[PDB]
Design an enzyme around this catalytic site. Sequence first.
Site, PDB file in Angstrom:
ATOM      1  N   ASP A 114      26.765 -19.174  31.787  1.00  5.89           N
ATOM      2  CA  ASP A 114      26.865 -20.224  32.797  1.00  5.89           C
ATOM      3  C   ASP A 114      28.206 -20.956  32.751  1.00  5.89           C
ATOM      4  O   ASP A 114      28.259 -22.188  32.675  1.00  5.89           O
ATOM      5  CB  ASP A 114      25.706 -21.211  32.659  1.00  5.89           C
ATOM      6  CG  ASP A 114      25.448 -21.977  33.935  1.00  5.89           C
ATOM      7  OD1 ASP A 114      25.876 -21.496  35.008  1.00  5.89           O
ATOM      8  OD2 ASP A 114      24.810 -23.049  33.867  1.00  5.89           O
ATOM      9  N   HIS A 146      26.234 -21.110  37.749  1.00  4.36           N
ATOM     10  CA  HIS A 146      25.127 -21.404  38.656  1.00  4.36           C
ATOM     11  C   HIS A 146      25.574 -22.206  39.888  1.00  4.36           C
ATOM     12  O   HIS A 146      24.917 -22.172  40.927  1.00  4.36           O
ATOM     13  CB  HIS A 146      23.985 -22.116  37.914  1.00  4.36           C
ATOM     14  CG  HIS A 146      23.141 -21.200  37.077  1.00  4.36           C
ATOM     15  ND1 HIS A 146      22.400 -20.173  37.618  1.00  4.36           N
ATOM     16  CD2 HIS A 146      22.910 -21.170  35.744  1.00  4.36           C
ATOM     17  CE1 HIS A 146      21.756 -19.540  36.653  1.00  4.36           C
ATOM     18  NE2 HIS A 146      22.049 -20.126  35.504  1.00  4.36           N
ATOM     19  N   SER A 162      25.903 -30.390  36.590  1.00  5.53           N
ATOM     20  CA  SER A 162      26.206 -29.011  36.188  1.00  5.53           C
ATOM     21  C   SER A 162      27.684 -28.675  36.345  1.00  5.53           C
ATOM     22  O   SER A 162      28.318 -29.074  37.325  1.00  5.53           O
ATOM     23  CB  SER A 162      25.377 -28.013  37.001  1.00  5.53           C
ATOM     24  OG  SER A 162      24.009 -28.061  36.638  1.00  5.53           O
TER      25      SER A 162
END
Lengths: 243, 56
Positions: free
Chosen positions: A98, A55, A193
Amino acid sequence: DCGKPQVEPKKCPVVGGCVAHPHSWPWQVSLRTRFGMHFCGGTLISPEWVLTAAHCLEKSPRPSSYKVILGAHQEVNLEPHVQEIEVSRLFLEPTRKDIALLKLSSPAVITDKVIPACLPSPNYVVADRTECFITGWGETQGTFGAGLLKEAQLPVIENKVCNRYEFLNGRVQSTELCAGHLAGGTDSCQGDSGGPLVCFEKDKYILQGVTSWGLGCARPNKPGVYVRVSRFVTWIEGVMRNN
Amino acid sequence: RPDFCELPADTGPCRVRFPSFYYNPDEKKCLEFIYGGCEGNANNFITKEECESTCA
């Protein structure tokens, strides 16, 4: 020696948690735009390779639009001894999970402030309630440490429990692992992230998760979901050796 | 001004830090918010201008 920091890490019993000892998480990476704004984490798994979440690479597939910062403690006021390396190649995981690999334009210099982490065993499952560490420059949500490398010691929550209705309710996949305190207050957030979820196993730190998502940040009964790295080890090995 | 200009700011479940903009009806302004990277809504803009030209 990977997974072994020359600066002994704090143990803290990112929203909540504590500001880490500088260079105690040497494999921590700050992924950046060409402008130089931190928007994601990354994990040095080898001198030319950084592991992150897919992402983070959504907008452009241009590897030159990505910048890898190493040996930092400050998100903005980078230490003079910091390493700034451009990305040479991106590798999105084929089943569209991801997780993604960044090949560095030049190999990082392994110092006592920049050391890589260790990869887990293929198909390895971190046992329930294992205490792991989360690091990153993500949102703090009114908590101290804004702009500094924050850490959190969180317990692993097995997917059978994590997918209970009370918690995430069937959202979590086989290739994901859950982690955090069910009382809330301490968790990864937006900006973390791609960041490492490391577990101290043998006598060193081993990368077991990649900061992916969560239903909010640091909320009660809402553990963070992480890409289960052990499921992609074989893929990671073959990318590093063939590319 | 399309309907989704009236929708609230959805950061999303992910945990990228994409700074973005959403239109704020009750303030009649385009304000900054963090987009998580996945899911969310159309009330999500990359420039302040894109928000303004669309929902203001």
